[PDB]
Amino acid sequence: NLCPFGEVFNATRFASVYAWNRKRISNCVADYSVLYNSASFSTFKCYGVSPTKLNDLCFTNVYADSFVIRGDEVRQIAPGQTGKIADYNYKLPDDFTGCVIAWNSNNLDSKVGGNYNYLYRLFRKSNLKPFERDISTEIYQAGSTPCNGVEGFNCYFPLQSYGFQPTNGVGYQPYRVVVLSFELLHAPATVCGPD
Amino acid sequence: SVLTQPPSVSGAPGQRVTISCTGSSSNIGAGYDVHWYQQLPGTAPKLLIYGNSNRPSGVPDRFSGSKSGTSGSLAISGLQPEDEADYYCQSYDSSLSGSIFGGGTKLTVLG
Amino acid sequence: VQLVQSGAEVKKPGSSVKVSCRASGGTFSSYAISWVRQAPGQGLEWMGTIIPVFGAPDYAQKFQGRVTITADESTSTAYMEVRSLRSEDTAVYYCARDASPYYYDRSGYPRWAEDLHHWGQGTMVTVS
Ligand SMILES: *[C@@H]1O[C@H](CO)[C@@H](O)[C@H](O)[C@H]1NC(C)=O
């Protein structure tokens, strides 16, 4: 049985980046040659491992993470980087062994008048740990007194929408992103490349 | 040859000031990104923007930037006397096989 | 991550100069180190780049042949030599470094990013 990469890369819809999705890949054969030969991708980069070697390697687990961001923000998805996405929405560990893959989704994820369903987290009282996630929409407070859940100056709602219109410049157009992470322990391999 | 950039710019306190940087068919015209640095006297350069518009953590929120056509731009906003420095742009050039830098821009406050 | 750099130089024309840099507070081996120069009152210039695990540098065409770059795994240190010096070689030289490790593209070639996130204190070299 081949691994279910069609449920990852060919789904209809993707998560908002503050509430990013993860999927586990196990007990299957991973034909990675399908991915790195594809013309579908506007960016494809691997860390710790070369793409051609993924056909030979074996892993205890594999994980696939999925979300939508702006075309300019993709550069914040790398080990050691900092910014609104890297600090408060999605954090990679310094040991990251895996690949980052992205493609333009303007015809899917934009709409006339702007698609406001996609959100990111603009505020948080402290930075994320690697692979941390959150949901709670509590008011960010930084004023002289507590905000008590009421909006105002230094009493801010923590999330902001992207608002993708169909005709904006390529750095403001929506991009779909997949991050693949490879895991190996003393516990036996459950994913391998084909032979 | 290298990225073309104006020698100096100026504005009043609390205003916006815009610095421009422009490439060729190589570099910015080939679709490569542009990055921006600041230098104070007697001191090594400091990064302000990467990836056309990404701003590091710990750079203040007045600095914004973009890329369009064969050009990129830096905007300084809510201007203060602390913002007097020399500003450089950078991009990759596939016809040099390495980095290229602009000629620099000394900002000045009008007082 | 903090870079630390060699002290200043004074030399006659036709002599040669050694410049050096050290990393601290993190991994040395997987990160690109780049050498930059700045003449007095003038814009920045890129000379060349090394990744220690591959050892062979990239060089800018103006500096290739007069300049050579090298690094040590055991001491977390990078070095440069400039040869057959002339008066216009009077400048400040900086080491600088990427914020991310090198990466493999779709064809398995190692690559590095042109952003200089971290900078050394700079070495003033002077030629009589
Ligand atoms: C996604 O769908 C296209 C069109 O059917 C196919 O060519 C491609 O291989 C698929 N990719 C994955 C990883 O499922």
Domain residue ranges in chain C: 4-127
The letter for the amino acid at A91 is: K
Residue B88 domain flag? yes
CA C115/CA B36 separation, integer angstroms = 9
B11: distance to nearest CA of chain A, Å? 29
Residue B84 domain flag? yes
CA B95/CA A151 separation, integer angstroms = 53
Taking Cα atoms as reference points, which of B66, B45, B44, B68 lies closest to residue B55? B66
Thinking of the domain A6-121+161-192, which architecture would CATH place it in?
2-Layer Sandwich (3.30)
Q: Do the beta carbons of residue A75 and residue A84 sit within 8 Å?
A: no
Residues 6+ apart with CB under 8 A from A186: none
The letter for the amino acid at B11 is: G
A36 contacts in C (CB within 8 Å)? Answer: 106
Region class of B69: left (phi > 0), else alpha (psi between -120 and 50), else beta: left
Experimental resolution (Å): 3.3
Residue B60 domain flag? yes
The Cα-based distances of A113 to A95, A164, A168, A173, C107 in angstroms read: 42, 8, 12, 14, 40
The topology (CATH level 3) of C4-127 is Immunoglobulin-like (2.60.40)
> Is A32 close to ligand 1, i.e. is its CB under 6 Å away?
no
Q: Do the beta carbons of residue C127 and residue C8 sit within 8 Å?
A: no
In chain B, the DSSP E strands lie at: 8-11, 17-22, 34-39, 46-49, 64-68, 71-76, 86-93, 98-101, 105-109
Supply the range of the domain harboring residue B97. Answer: 8-109
Sheet with B71-76, strands from edge to edge, namely: B17-22, B71-76, B64-68
Residue B2 domain flag? no
CA atoms B49, B51, B55, B59: torsion sign: negative
Cα A3 to middle of ligand 1, angstroms: 13
CA B1/CA B4 separation, integer angstroms = 8
CA A143/CA A156 separation, integer angstroms = 10
The letter for the amino acid at B68 is: S
Q: Which helix (H) or strand (E) segment is A10 a member of?
A: none
Q: Do the beta carbons of residue C17 and residue C82 sit within 8 Å?
A: yes
Q: Which helix (H) or strand (E) segment is A139 a member of?
A: none
Query: In terms of CA atoms, which chain C residue is nearest residue B3?
Result: C43
Cα A158 to middle of ligand 1, angstroms: 36
Cα A38 to middle of ligand 1, angstroms: 9
Residue B1 domain flag? no
The Cα-based distances of A102 to A40, A69, A105, A164, B95 in angstroms read: 9, 10, 9, 17, 27
For A59, counting Cβ atoms within 10 Å of its Cβ (0-12 exposed, 13-18 middle, 19+ buried), the class is buried
Q: Do the beta carbons of residue A32 and residue A51 sit within 8 Å?
A: yes
Structural domain spans, chain A: 6-121+161-192
In this structure, what is the dihedral angle of CA atoms B23, B24, B26, B31, given to the nearest 10 degrees? 60
Number of H helices, E strands in chain B: 0, 9
In A97-173, the DSSP E strands lie at: 98-104, 119-121, 140-141, 155-156, 159-161
Taking Cα atoms as reference points, which of A100, A83, A62, A12 lies closest to residue C115? A83
Residue A35's SS3 state is helix
CA C105/CA A43 separation, integer angstroms = 9
Start-end of H helices in A21-170? 33-36, 84-88, 106-109
Residues 6+ apart with CB under 8 A from A6: none
B54: distance to nearest CA of chain A, Å? 7
CATH number at residue B21: 2.60.40.10
Residue B49 domain flag? yes
Residues 6+ apart with CB under 8 A from A84: A76, A120, A121, A122
Q: How far is residue B14 CA from its own chain's centroid?
A: 20
Residues 6+ apart with CB under 8 A from B81: B13, B109
For A142, counting Cβ atoms within 10 Å of its Cβ (0-12 exposed, 13-18 middle, 19+ buried), the class is exposed
C-alpha distance across the termini of chain C, in Å: 35
Number of domains in chain B: 1
**Angle at CA of residue A181, ends A7 and A118, nearest 5°:** 55
Residue B3 domain flag? no
Q: Do the beta carbons of residue A19 and residue A65 sit within 8 Å?
A: no
Count other C-beta atoms under 10 Å from residue A174's C-beta.
Answer: 21
Q: Do the beta carbons of residue A69 and residue A118 sit within 8 Å?
A: no
Residue B77 domain flag? yes
